[PDB]
């Protein structure tokens, strides 16, 4: 086969991953709950670092996105910690239906338990930049 | 009017400054522990964080004295999810477990504030890079 070798450096990109997809028009990093009150960077409670993906469903579907999401990480570890967990926050019953569905597939396909949690999007805070001091 | 200095000191220097020159402590090694993944690496730590292995001579210093040093080095009275404010004791046997729990309760009783230090069993410990374990490629 052929071989390419690239170094990305530091100026990427948990959002750049999804942003590079055909049909997603913008992405924002944010913190998604979860119903813990008053999350902070010091204590996120049940909120998780998340990507809000605004996409044109005439170009990609929610199931195609689901597919790339699952190929972009390896959620085969038991972990209680909301912050290290693979999570899907559904916005409707359809997304949820679709997300439970493909999870079942993948688990069969390989046998492994997949630990992605399916929970409704109840809160979403944009990420704040750190305050500069002068 | 006060004056300002700004310094950067890497995290892995801390262990030897915190415990290294304590009488009875023979060595300290920085590592990674407390996560899930079978093999963290320089490129991805998974859910592990900075931990320290302290080798000590019990005829000189006790585990209790080390716990007192650990709790004199920080003030874990706020719930946190943040790795930079981690407070964790990894007990190697039930003797260490019970000494850590008993001292935690004593601190809580004496100062009136819940202590958010987690006391959990040591399962795996990975040796991290250092000036005496450079990990030459």
Residue numbers in the entry:
A (entry chain A): 7 to 140
B (entry chain B): 6 to 142
Quote what the paper states about this structure:
The anaerobic gram-positive bacterium Clostridium oremlandii contains a selenocysteine (Sec)-containing MsrA (CoMsrA). We recently determined the crystal structures of CoMsrA using the Cys version proteins. This enzyme is found to be a structurally unusual MsrA composed of two domains, a catalytic domain and a distinct helical domain absent from other known MsrA structures.
The crystal structure of the ΔH-domain form comprising residues 1–144, corresponding to the catalytic domain, was determined at a resolution of 1.76 Å. The final refined model contains chain A comprising 134 residues (7–140) and chain B comprising 137 residues (6–142). The monomer structure of the ΔH-domain protein folds into a similar rolled mixed β-sheet with three helices located at the exterior sides. Each N-terminus including residues 6–18 extends outwards from the original molecule of full-length form, intruding between β2 and β3 of another symmetric molecule and forming a complete rolled mixed β-sheet. The ΔH-domain protein predominantly existed as a dimer in solution, which is in agreement with the crystallographic data. In contrast, in dimer B, Cys16 residues are closely located at a distance of 3.6 Å, but no disulfide bond is observed. Loss of interactions with the catalytic domain by deleting the helical domain leads to collapse of the active site, thereby causing a loss of activity.
